[PDB]
Design a protein around this ligand. Structure first.
Ligand SMILES: CCCCCCCCCCCCCCCCCC(=O)OC[C@H](COP(=O)([O-])OCC(O)COP(=O)([O-])OC[C@@H](COC(=O)CCCCCCCCCCCCCCCCC)OC(=O)CCCCCCCCCCCCCCCCC)OC(=O)CCCCCCCCCCCCCCCCC
Ligand SMILES: CCCCC/C=C/C/C=C/C/C=C\C/C=C\CCCC(=O)O[C@H](COC(=O)CCCCCCCCCCCCCCCCC)COP(=O)(O)O[C@@H]1[C@H](O)[C@H](O)[C@@H](O)[C@H](O)[C@H]1O
Ligand SMILES: CCCCC/C=C/C/C=C\CCCCCCCC(=O)O[C@H](COC(=O)CCCCCCCCCCCCCCC)COP(=O)([O-])OCC[N+](C)(C)C
Lengths: 469, 164, 216, 114, 122, 89, 337
């Protein structure tokens, strides 16, 4: 369904004008919507945690992969709606959010790479999917190359990801040299006990986790997120993280790892404290993503963590999309635009937003409280599942670090709300232009999901218990 | 047509009897219910209808302008594609014994009864060497689980369908 | 709190100080075989704020002591190159300014505001002409940051945005293709954040009116 | 074994590179006559030159197309062994590549100055 | 790697030289302190092993030696004139045909991307 | 493997130190990929197994595509297209 | 050939046949590949073959607008062209038929000759005019192109007139930053040469849907030392009307002749009627008009100037302010031609 979309897009975009980009992106938006709503019945293949191997043991298929797959389509639909649909029908918003001719094709190829990462069963398939995603994401980062701020980020991301992919390939080839194999099916309890292949898996996890940017290799991706266009940043900071973390969770190669635990604690501390030292919105959200990545990395130290990870990644994806879309909507209520690519930079520019759109500030307050973990929002429940999982395995110091990190992060989360509920006497230079109904509906749906998804907690728990056991 | 490796016999993928672990493309299309064709037409009309509804909700250039015939035709082709994929997957899960497949089971029974009466092989004879048959079966085994990602169908008359 | 400090101004060329001149250097075409001369003075008179003086001669005659050159006759000054040794910042941050204001008396000469910032190439320059509207009187000419035009070797090029996060030096130079003495008296150069909309001429210049506002 | 060689070789050549790079700390401070470039004067009067995007695209796209062609060599060495299955796979491979070739033809990205 | 990759490298560098555009040389002394810290940490990590090196360095000691010659024996179980490239083609077209198709998509990406970021459409 | 591992070490440390020498950093990327391919091919020969060589050719193709993308990035970065668009629309 | 014959020979080629291919070949035989640099025949010596080209250049229509470009090139390669003719060509290749690309290139032609050959330099009058022409077709490409040409000009400079039309060029393309940037530069200038009624005319038109900044702009006029004009009042009346302030607009029109002595014109009164979107408020507009401006209304009924666009009936579902945006946006197109 994705390969056919990619081929059809190359063919159709080849023979189309530049003005047809919005229409093509809308067409793919409804195409993916129909793919989800019409082919969703494939979840019947995974009753009682039934697992399949596809393409000569090169791919794995179970309920976990299916759910991550559907979540990636939902995120792709939201992000592509952000490109096809025009927020405001005026020339300025025309200029800021204008998709490139190849952006949708690169987006779909990156989705394909992420899915192949999630579904990988062999190191050859894993490396090929990693390279596909990496090259696609480099091209996504570089496709807006009319600024040196974006150009330096593109070049840095290319080089750092090249080093990381080389390290991943080196680890995979060391594993092959040790075992003369390219799959995890040759690893059993006896295999792990008899031979010391732990360091190979530690190196592989290191290379994979550095691609999403855990400490002490966080600064480069934070700079990249700061400097890329915000409609690009919303995508490049979610999908690769989801793919890498899902592959790491399903691989289950870091049980009670000291190195992984220490790096997770370092990631949490760096994300929490460094967020306090931020005056830019993009850097603040980058450190927020770092803290969430540390939270999810804490789940890599124990088994039977599928439910907690799935719940947390879904709620975090929804909250991430919601917060970036709130930041996008707030662009209309500022008197000047920083760059063509990043129109808002500093948190101080959101000052007094409650006097321009009080319900936008209400939605932002809901999403920020969910980030902090205020009940009964989804973020609190995800953090609670993480706490239950870590206390079931006896990680008490990890739990204390988690609680302290959340308390520290609450300060710079409430920084946003405190700035936004201030008073701005400077009235707007713009008035009464109507915001897009489709994008507003999507943002409101995300906010309502965050607010009232705790209704279906028992239903989701039962579905997990029947479809994952 | 002699299998080279051992395969599961009458494995239950759901609450219904197994008909074919790796049904052929022609087999899957031939065992297609009228409801699946209704689904195909539903999608084939839904993408153009979805485009029109999206245009009505938020016009691209402010004023409501129906999409050109080129976009309608591309949407029609893609709708036929997604509907055909959904219909193929539904028929497959009927073959896998996941959904209701009583009529398909009876038609399958009558079909190999007739084939055995005619003195043919149960799942065909191939142009491919038995090693290539095994490779094809191992590649196409349960390939419908990746319908979201890529299309892949069994075009090889291999004996690895998991039956007696 | 303890976040990086935020401010609405940053003085680049301050002058008005005993040292001042230590912050800037000068370059004429005496680096080439040319005969143009540059010299930077410091005037601190009464009944006013002390200013810098940037004068000289711009003889365009070619250097008849060598041949590979084709066009000469420049004279400029710039801020000292940013010292990045082992631990300090590296350069200037202009990500919250969008303007640069400089207060100067001008003359008939056509000066350029020259900015050096981070760039893959070496001799790339972001330069915008210093539009002297009122000659002989001080004017606070403001130049928007995102209007400088990238030039390498003096040729307009692919207009990619300035890297405001990494800016090295700012200066004023003469590339005018005309003979004659030149002069330019500057007393500050600073980058100023976005001003809110105003509908008065200025506080420094005023015209007769009813003065509705209550006198202090 | 490769990991061992890597780990022990890191400190030695790392220190060597560290020492040889602390050397340039001060050196040729490029005090050359960089005065005409910090102003915006030009001394060429010529040597403008140009490069259409299509030229550099020909140069760059020589590489992926050459990889596409050289990927056909493994097929022609085992054409008989994988006859029909491999024939279909190669047909799909070629059609996917021709999708990109159609992209580069329709876009007219490779047409030099007209 | 030579007739395509190295040729394109030299082509791109030659493009940089005909119209002389010297590349600005930034200082790495900014990043030297982190290299100092990390490399001292790595040396210390290799150093506190000390006594345990007596039972770990020996592994590398016999690793360096490798004073045995492989014995090459002959057999007649192969009748087909099969070379390395033939086996590559066989595996890539039958066992890992999915990998071949995904690399087709990768080459598709390598075609599209340079076009996307190199030319200005319309 | 000796030669591949040592080439990888030298190129990796050349990358770490320069880090601002984009031409040389991208060269170091190419040489690190070459060093990994050498190790993989040697182990494939030692084990007499085809998977090592298959992954080697896959790495070759991926390295070519990566080199093409990176050289396009360098073209965009250094403005190799040139301009001379003066006195034009 | 003899000059006298060449007058009728050339006149027959263009005005009677329009054989452009034949026309180019003829002159390469008489003068001969002027790139050889041997002849630069002066029009002043004999403006006969010069005139027939000059006549056909300034006569092409929208369909033949492309043809006027080639004939312009031969007019400059062969004959030396007076500098004053640049104004006519720039006004022709822009404000006359349809094409504005040649307006920029004609301006670029003056630049290239001045830098290299030594021809007299362009004046700031063109860039002020050519910004204004760009602010009519919302030509986003030309504004960016011309700005950076201005930003690195060593012959002409920026003054009051360039900034005014440059500001108007940015309102057309809706650039909130550049508009405020040009306003800062105009503001920081003495009122002697600086903010004029043209400045207020653009500034009000950019605040067309912001009643707060439209008002504070109106009080800005007395501060700069200015008296509003008829073209200045009209946009103020539009801005008050398009934001629902129908009633306040009438008092402004009724008391404008008392306050300033500027009698309301037809383009003022018809504007108030056009942008009043209430069927009763539209009536009160035509209550003083019958008994205060009787003669000058009656010539608007047959001219179809009055337009009766209003707001829907069951439209209270939406914002009233949102309706006024849609009503005024439709009305702007109706008054654009
Ligand atoms: O009549 C033949 C048969 C009709 O029934 P039959 O006579 O009983 O024969 C059935 C078996 O073919 C009889 O057994 P068999 O082994 O003889 O069949 C094996 C088959 C070849 O073995 C295969 O099964 C090869 C298929 C490989 C995988 C197919 C999966 C499809 C994946 C789609 C691509 C996306 C990839 C994702 C990328 C990531 O042998 C052939 O000779 C078939 C090739 C026929 C023509 C070559 C291909 C046609 C054009 C290709 C595209 C269509 C346009 O149907 C076919 O011809 C099937 C081939 C069509 C493949 C479609 C490709 C999509
Ligand atoms: C499993 C759980 C996961 C996710 C849960 C999320 C969503 C639940 C599922 C589906 C949600 C879809 C609902 C369709 C019904 C929504 C609906 O009334 O239409 C639209 C937006 O319509 C989407 O933009 C429809 C967007 C469809 C996709 C939404 C996905 C988020 C809202 O009306 P509206 O008053 O703005 O309608 C328009 C009106 O039609 C025009 O005539 C006017 O000109 C215009 O101003 C405005 O009044
Ligand atoms: C008409 C067809 C449209 C279907 C398209 C669905 C797209 C899913 C996309 C993005 C995620 C959004 C939330 C999905 C809810 C989880 C479903 C489930 O139950 O999660 C379970 C696994 O729970 C888990 O581990 C943890 C899940 C974490 C959820 C976090 C969000 C909580 C709030 C959401 C509550 C829903 C509000 C609906 C209001 C009417 C998968 O269930 P399953 O694999 O057995 O298949 C499901 C049958 N299905 C495919 C037809 C749907």
């Amino acid at each position: 369904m994705l390969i056919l979309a990619i081929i059809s897009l190359i063919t159709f975009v080849s023979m189309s004008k530049l003005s047809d980009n919005r229409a093509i992106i809308r067409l793919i938006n409804i195409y993916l919507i129909l793919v989800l709503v019409l082919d969703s019945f494939l979840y019947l293949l995974f009753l009682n945690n039934q697992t399949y191997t596809v393409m000569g043991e090169l791919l794995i298929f179970n309920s976990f992969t299916f759910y991550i797959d559907m979540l990636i389509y939902f995120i792709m639909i939201v992000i592509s709606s952000l490109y096809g649909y025009n927020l405001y029908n005026n020339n300025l918003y025309k200029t800021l959010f204008e998709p490139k001719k190849e952006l949708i094709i690169l987006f779909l190829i990156n989705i394909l790479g992420a899915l192949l990462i999630v579904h990988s069963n062999d190191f050859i398939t894993l490396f090929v999917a990693i390279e596909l995603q990496s090259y696609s994401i480099y091209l996504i980062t570089a496709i807006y190359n009319s600024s040196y701020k974006a150009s330096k980020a593109s070049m840095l991301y290319f080089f750092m990801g090249g080093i990381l992919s080389i390290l991943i390939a080196y680890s995979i080839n060391t594993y092959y040299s040790v075992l003369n194999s390219y799959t995890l099916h040759s690893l059993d309890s006896l295999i792990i006990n008899t031979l010391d292949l732990n360091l190979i898996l530690i190196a592989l996890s290191l290379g994979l986790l550095f691609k999403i940017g855990i400490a002490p290799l966080h600064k480069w991706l934070i700079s990249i997120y700061e400097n890329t266009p915000i409609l690009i940043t919303i995508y490049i900071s979610l999908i690769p993280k989801i793919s890498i973390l899902s592959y790491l969770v399903l691989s289950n190669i870091s049980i009670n790892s000291l190195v992984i635990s220490i790096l997770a604690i370092l990631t949490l501390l760096v994300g929490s404290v460094g967020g306090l030292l931020q005056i830019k919105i993009k850097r603040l959200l980058a450190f927020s993503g770092l803290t969430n990545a540390g939270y999810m990395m804490l789940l890599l130290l124990l088994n039977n963590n599928e439910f907690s990870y799935l719940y947390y990644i879904t709620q975090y994806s929804i909250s991430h999309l919601a917060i970036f879309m709130i930041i996008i909507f707030s662009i209309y209520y500022i008197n000047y635009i920083n760059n063509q690519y990043n129109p808002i930079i500093y948190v101080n520019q959101l000052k007094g937003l409650i006097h321009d759109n009080a319900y936008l500030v209400l939605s932002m307050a809901i999403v920020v409280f969910s980030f902090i973990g205020i009940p009964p929002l989804l973020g609190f429940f995800g953090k609670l599942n993480i706490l239950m999982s870590i206390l079931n395995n006896g990680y008490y110091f990890i739990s204390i670090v988690l609680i302290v990190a959340s308390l520290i992060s609450a300060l710079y989360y409430l920084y946003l709300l405190n700035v936004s509920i201030q008073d701005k006497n400077n009235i707007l230079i713009n008035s009464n232009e109507t915001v897009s109904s489709v994008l507003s509906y999507i943002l409101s749906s995300l906010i309502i999901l965050i607010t009232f998804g705790f209704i279906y907690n028992s239903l989701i728990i039962d579905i997990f218990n029947v479809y994952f056991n | 047509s002699t299998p080279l490796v051992k395969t599961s016999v009458n494995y239950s993928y759901g609450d219904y009897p197994l008909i074919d672990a790796d049904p052929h493309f022609k087999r899957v299309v031939g065992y297609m219910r009228p409801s699946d064709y209704g689904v195909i037409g539903l999608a084939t009309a839904a993408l153009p209808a979805g485009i029109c509804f999206a245009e009505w909700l938020d016009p691209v250039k402010g004023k409501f302008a129906r999409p050109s015939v080129k976009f309608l035709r591309v949407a029609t082709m893609l709708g036929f594609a997604v509907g055909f994929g959904a219909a193929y997957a539904r028929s497959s899960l009927r073959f896998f014994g996941v959904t209701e497949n009583a009529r398909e089971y009876k038609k399958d029974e009558a079909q190999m009864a007739a084939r055995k009466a005619a003195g043919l092989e149960p799942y065909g004879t191939s142009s491919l060497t038995p090693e290539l048959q095994e490779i094809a079966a191992k590649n196409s085994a349960h390939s419908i689980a990746g319908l979201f990602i890529f299309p892949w169908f069994n075009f090889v008359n291999h004996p690895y369908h998991g039956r007696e | 709190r303890l976040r990086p400090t935020e401010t609405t101004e940053q003085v680049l060329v301050n002058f008005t100080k005993p040292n001042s001149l230590e912050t800037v250097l000068t370059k004429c075409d005496e680096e080439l075989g040319g005969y143009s001369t540059v010299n930077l003075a410091l005037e601190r008179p009464t009944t006013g704020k002390p200013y810098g003086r940037f004068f000289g001669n711009l003889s365009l005659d070619l250097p008849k002591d060598n041949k590979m050159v084709t066009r000469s006759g420049f004279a400029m000054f710039r801020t000292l190159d940013q010292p990045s040794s082992m631990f300090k910042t590296n350069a200037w941050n202009w990500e919250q300014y969008r303007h640069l204001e400089l207060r100067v008396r001008g003359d008939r000469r056509k000066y350029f505001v020259n900015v050096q910032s981070a760039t893959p190439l070496a001799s790339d320059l972001y330069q915008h002409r210093l539009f002297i509207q009122t000659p002989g009187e001080w004017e606070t000419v403001v130049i928007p940051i995102d209007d400088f035009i990238l030039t390498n070797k003096g040729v307009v090029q692919e207009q990619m945005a300035m890297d405001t996060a990494n800016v090295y030096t700012v200066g004023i130079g003469l590339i005018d293709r005309q003979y004659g003495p030149y002069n330019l008296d500057i007393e500050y150069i600073k980058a100023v954040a976005h001003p809110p909309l105003e509908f008065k001429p200025k506080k420094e210049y005023e015209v007769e009116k009813e003065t509705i506002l209550l006198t202090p | 074994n490769t990991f061992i060689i890597f780990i022990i070789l890191i400190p030695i050549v790392g220190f060597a590179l560290l020492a040889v790079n602390i050397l340039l700390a001060v050196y040729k401070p490029y005090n050359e006559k960089l005065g005409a470039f910090e102003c915006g004067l030009t001394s060429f009067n010529q040597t403008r030159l140009a490069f259409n995007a299509a030229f550099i695209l020909v140069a760059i796209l020589f590489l992926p197309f050459d990889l596409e062609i050289s990927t056909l060599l493994p097929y022609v060495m085992s054409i008989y062994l994988v006859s029909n299955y491999g024939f279909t796979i190669v047909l799909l491979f070629l059609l996917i590549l021709i999708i990109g070739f159609v992209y580069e033809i329709n876009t007219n990205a490779l047409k030099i100055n007209k | 790697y030579i007739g395509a990759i190295a040729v394109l490298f030299l082509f791109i560098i030659t493009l940089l030289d005909i119209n002389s555009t010297e590349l600005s040389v930034k200082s790495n002394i900014r990043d030297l302190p982190l290299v100092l810290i990390s490399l001292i940490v790595l040396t210390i990590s290799g150093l506190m092993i000390y006594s345990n090196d007596s039972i770990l360095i020996n592994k590398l000691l016999e690793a360096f030696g490798n004073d045995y010659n492989t014995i090459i024996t002959q057999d007649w179980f192969n009748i087909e004139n099969t070379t390395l490239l033939t086996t590559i083609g066989n595996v890539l077209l039958t066992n890992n045909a999915f990998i071949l198709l995904v690399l087709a998509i990768v080459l598709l990406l390598g075609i599209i991307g340079p076009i996307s970021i190199t030319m200005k459409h319309k | 493997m000796f030669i591949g591992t040592i080439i990888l070490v030298l190129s990796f440390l050349g990358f770490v130190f320069n880090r601002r020498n984009i031409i040389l950093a991208f060269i170091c990327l190419e040489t690190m990929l070459l060093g990994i391919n050498l190790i993989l091919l040697r182990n494939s020969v030692l084990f007499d197994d085809i998977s090592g060589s298959l992954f080697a050719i896959v790495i070759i193709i991926l390295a070519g595509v990566e080199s093409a993308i990176g050289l396009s990035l360098l073209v965009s970065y250094y403005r190799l297209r040139g301009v001379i668009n003066s006195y034009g629309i | 050939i003899p000059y006298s014959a060449e007058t009728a020979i050339a006149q027959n080629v263009l005005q009677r046949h329009s054989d452009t291919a034949n026309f180019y070949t003829f002159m390469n035989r008489q003068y001969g590949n002027t790139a050889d640099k041997v002849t630069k025949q002066d029009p002043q010596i004999r403006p006969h073959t010069y005139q027939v080209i000059h006549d056909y250049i300034y006569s092409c229509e929208s369909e033949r607008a492309d043809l006027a470009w080639e004939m312009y090139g031969l007019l400059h390669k062969f004959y030396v062209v007076p500098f004053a003719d640049y104004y006519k060509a720039i006004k022709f290749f822009a404000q006359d038929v349809k094409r504005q690309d040649y307006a920029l290139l004609t301006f670029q032609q003056i630049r290239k000759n001045h830098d290299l050959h030594g021809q007299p330099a362009a004046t700031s009058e063109m860039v002020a005019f050519l910004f204004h022409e760009f602010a009519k077709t919302k030509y986003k490409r030309g504004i960016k192109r011309l700005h950076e040409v201005v930003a690195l000009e060593t012959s002409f400079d920026v003054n009051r007139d360039v900034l005014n039309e440059m500001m108007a060029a940015y309102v057309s393309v809706e650039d909130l930053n550049r508009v405020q940037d040009c306003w800062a530069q105009l503001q920081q200038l003495p009122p002697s040469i600086g903010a004029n009624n043209r400045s207020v005319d653009v500034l009000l038109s950019y605040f067309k849907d912001n009643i707060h900044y439209t008002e504070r702009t109106w009080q800005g006029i007395p501060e700069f030392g200015l008296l509003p004009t008829l073209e200045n009042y009209e946009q103020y009346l539009i801005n008050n009307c398009r934001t629902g302030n129908y009633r306040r607009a009438l008092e402004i029109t009724k008391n404008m002749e008392i306050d300033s002595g500027l009698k309301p014109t037809a383009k003022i009164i018809a504007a108030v009627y056009n942008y009043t979107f209430t069927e009763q408020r539209k009536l009160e507009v035509e209550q003083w008009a019958e008994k205060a401006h009787p003669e000058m209304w009656l010539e608007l009924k047959e001219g179809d100037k009055l337009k009766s666009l209003c707001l829907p009936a069951n439209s209270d579902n939406d914002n009233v302010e949102s309706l006024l945006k849609q009503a005024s946006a439709d009305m702007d197109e109706e008054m654009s031609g």
